[PDB]
Amino acid sequence: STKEFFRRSKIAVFEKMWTYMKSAEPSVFVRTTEEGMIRVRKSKGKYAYLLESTMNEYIEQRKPCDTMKVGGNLDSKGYGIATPKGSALRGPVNLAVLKLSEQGVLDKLKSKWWYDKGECGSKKTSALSLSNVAGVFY
């Protein structure tokens, strides 16, 4: 959906991205998401991946914790709970989801399975530090 979103974009910035996109990287694109993560990790900051925010956060909280998410979200979409057309589990399910969201359940589960189970942590001055001039003191 990301390639389609960029291709079919009417915005200036993403239009410029698409103009750059499909260039001679040779291959900025990728086939597997794990492939993109590995490529970014191998590259010494020379590659940036575009992906869903949730997975970006999860990966950021995964060992070795050598990658980060930066910036806001280019697009805006959602994940939902599906029932077949003409089912009796339509209204009750939507009501339950909304009640959970107001009660804060979903945010708590998010924090639990993204941060309270992350291998990594939870979370300035340009003044010269003693590490810069240590050799002088030695």
Binding site: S1, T2, F5, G36, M37, V40, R41, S43, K44, G45, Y47, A48, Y49, L50, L51, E52, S53, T54, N56, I59, C65, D66, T67, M68, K69, V70, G71, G72, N73, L74, D75, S76, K77, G78, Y79, G80, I81, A82, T83, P84, K85, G86, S87, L89, R90, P92, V93, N94, L95, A96, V97, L98, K99, L100, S101, V105, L106, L109, K110, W113
Partner: protein, 96 residues
Amino acid sequence: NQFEGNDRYEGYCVELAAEIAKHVGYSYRLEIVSDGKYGARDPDTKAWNGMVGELVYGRADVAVAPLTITLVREEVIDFSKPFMSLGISIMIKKPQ
């Protein structure tokens, strides 16, 4: 192998389904889409390939997974208000 049924599955969606069924008040049995792919139609065959198929063909009664909300699916499926908003984002090497 130690646990059988739903007790062997752990994750966000599992607890979400637990809470949802608790509020609705129904018993549920989990499974997994054999195709292991999210719903999508064959352009020529006009057949859905994934959990959307397991829903619209009567195989399944509800889907609790990261189903992206789209126009193609919303026509043949009844979604719920998003439980997780989301977007495209930028991933970079963590500056050492």
